[PDB]
Amino acid sequence: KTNIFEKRINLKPYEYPELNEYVAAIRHSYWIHTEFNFTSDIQDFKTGLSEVERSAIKNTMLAISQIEVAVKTFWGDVHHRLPKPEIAAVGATFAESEVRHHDAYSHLLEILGLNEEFKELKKKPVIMKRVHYLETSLKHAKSDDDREYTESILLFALFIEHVSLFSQFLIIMAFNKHKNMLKGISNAVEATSKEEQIHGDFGVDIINIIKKENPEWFDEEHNNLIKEMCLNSFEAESKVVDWIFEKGELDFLPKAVINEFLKNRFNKSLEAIGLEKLFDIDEALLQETEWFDDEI
Amino acid sequence: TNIFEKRINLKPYEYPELNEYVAAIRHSYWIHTEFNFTSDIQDFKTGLSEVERSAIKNTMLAISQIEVAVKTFWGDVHHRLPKPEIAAVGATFAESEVRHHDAYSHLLEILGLNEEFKELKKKPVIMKRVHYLETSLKHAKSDDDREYTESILLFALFIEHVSLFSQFLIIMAFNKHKNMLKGISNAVEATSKEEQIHGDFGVDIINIIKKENPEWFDEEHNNLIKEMCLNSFEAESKVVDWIFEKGELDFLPKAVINEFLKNRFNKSLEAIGLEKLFDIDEALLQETEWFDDEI
């Protein structure tokens, strides 16, 4: 008789006690940027990096920080659609973790002398288009039918948190891997990724609950709509990657390699919710980022 | 600068002073697992009378359930004050309410009082308060900006600085007067520090709204707030009667709790620039001077 969409006022008993484990998971992964040491990173950025490298780092941290503001809102609003106190508890715990994250990356931009980047956001059409896309998506996640709600969860929890943000974490961590630079920032990125992993995992679980409770909504037509949405998301993400590298590609982490890493994570997101892979993976391009998953 | 106007870009903050509240909660952050409730379980089972057990049970049920609504309020503030720095505080506060409701539901569980949540619908006094906050969450979402200071006043002050503080007082009175519930008293102290911060933020944002929109706050509006405060006090006194449905605590009578409430209602009105409403009985108020001395 359990219906994830039906409001329950009383805190206990939980109808989904297994989902409560996500609150403990984030309490375990909890971190603030002040736990890390960025002193050497500042000098690495200001003296060690090339103009092309500085620009890629600056654009990546601006993209992470600003998008996390929207991801926070998504999680803080989930209870409006899935009005269960235990789900609301996860949502609030996740929203606060996004604030710790956006504070970390805005702090890094500040200490690197890159504060002006947020003021000029309106003048960066590629990243601002992504910002508006998420603002529009937050409106849809609030007002669209329950039948379509799995698409809002898929967008934020998977396509943004498990896919888009992971490619950005990959970009930053590649500096430590290939150049032995930005070690402190790489530690903060690793701490961020562990929390984003948890977020997407919860997104997978709630999509699977919705599918289990409402099997009639998830027909062949629905699966095709998700595949088209995934292809649209990839095309949009590839354009975000092109903007990150507007001043030039990193020879140690080319765009083709980042794009293959994205396609593979999109495939894993589809598979997690019971759908078939969409992208035919180039194993040589994918092997180039195997170190990332081994590091996490 | 307009607190009600959406700003998309994270930085620069328009209200950088409000950001300090994020650091404040990160400093006060706690989980119930940091405390030891072994001695408390024993006090509840053998040290407390049936009248005392009932007051503790009702108080923790009231705190835990109301914290679920307070969490939602903070998580929704961004919808009305769409500034990323305010949204950051709101999310940080909403998560602190989850740590709090987890602490009190855990305490109810370990004391063998789990069935209390199942029977909420059958407790009209506390359930009326529950529905009042659900209704207030709808109004905090949809009413005019002109009235938004009343939603903040209700949740951040009348609930977090007043109602919940009387409930913290009830529990902490057992440690003060009977040297019992020491572990629970430590958790209540940790909760109170975070609720203090929440109300302080509520005062700051109400004061910003008043400063930016002075024309809304005329003599008629100030009288509406005073009437709302009187109504809130009358409603709170009924919640106190229900907490003590099995009988009053001789060491903390209802008259003393009610005077503590009136004094905190006065402090909340004064914080937002209004005059005191209640003419305080100093003998009744003196009885709870220890509480502020403890925290």
Numbering used by the authors:
A (entry chain A): 103 to 398
B (entry chain B): 104 to 398
From the paper:
Ribonucleotide reductase (RNR) is the only enzyme capable of de novo synthesis of deoxyribonucleotides (dNTPs). Class I RNRs consist of a substrate-binding component (NrdA or α) and a radical-generating component (NrdB or β). Conversely, class Id RNRs from Facklamia ignava, Leeuwenhoekiella blandensis and Flavobacterium johnsoniae are all proposed to function without an organic radical, and instead utilize a mixed valent Mn2(IV,III) metal centre. Here, we crystallized and solved the structures of an N-terminally truncated form of LbNrdB lacking the ATP-cone domain, LbNrdBΔ99, in two forms: apo and aerobically Mn2+ loaded.
The apo form of LbNrdB∆99 also crystallized in P212121 with one dimer in the asymmetric unit, but with different cell dimensions. In the apo form in NrdB subunits, the metal-coordinating residues adjust to occupy the space vacated by the metal ions and engage in a network of H-bonds to each other. Two of these H-bonds are unusually short, i.e. between Glu170 and the water molecule (2.4 Å) and between Glu263 and His301 (2.5 Å). A more dramatic change between apo- and Mn2+-forms is seen in Lys174, which is in the apo form projected away from the metal site and into a water-filled channel between the two monomers of the dimer. This suggests that formation of the dimanganic site is accompanied by a refolding of the loop containing residues 171–174 (see below). In contrast, in the apo state, helix B is an uninterrupted α-helix, albeit that residues 177–179 near the C terminus are distorted towards 310 conformation in both the apo- and Mn2+-states. In the apo form, Glu237 on helix D makes a salt bridge to Lys109 in the other monomer. However triggered, the conformational changes clearly open up a channel from the surface of the protein that leads to the Mn site, which has previously been proposed to be important for the diffusion of superoxide. This channel is absent in the apo form of L. blandensis NrdB. The metal site is completely occluded in the apo state, thus metallation would require some proportion of the population to exist in a more open form that would allow Mn2+ to diffuse in and occupy one or more of the sites, driving the equilibrium towards the more open form.
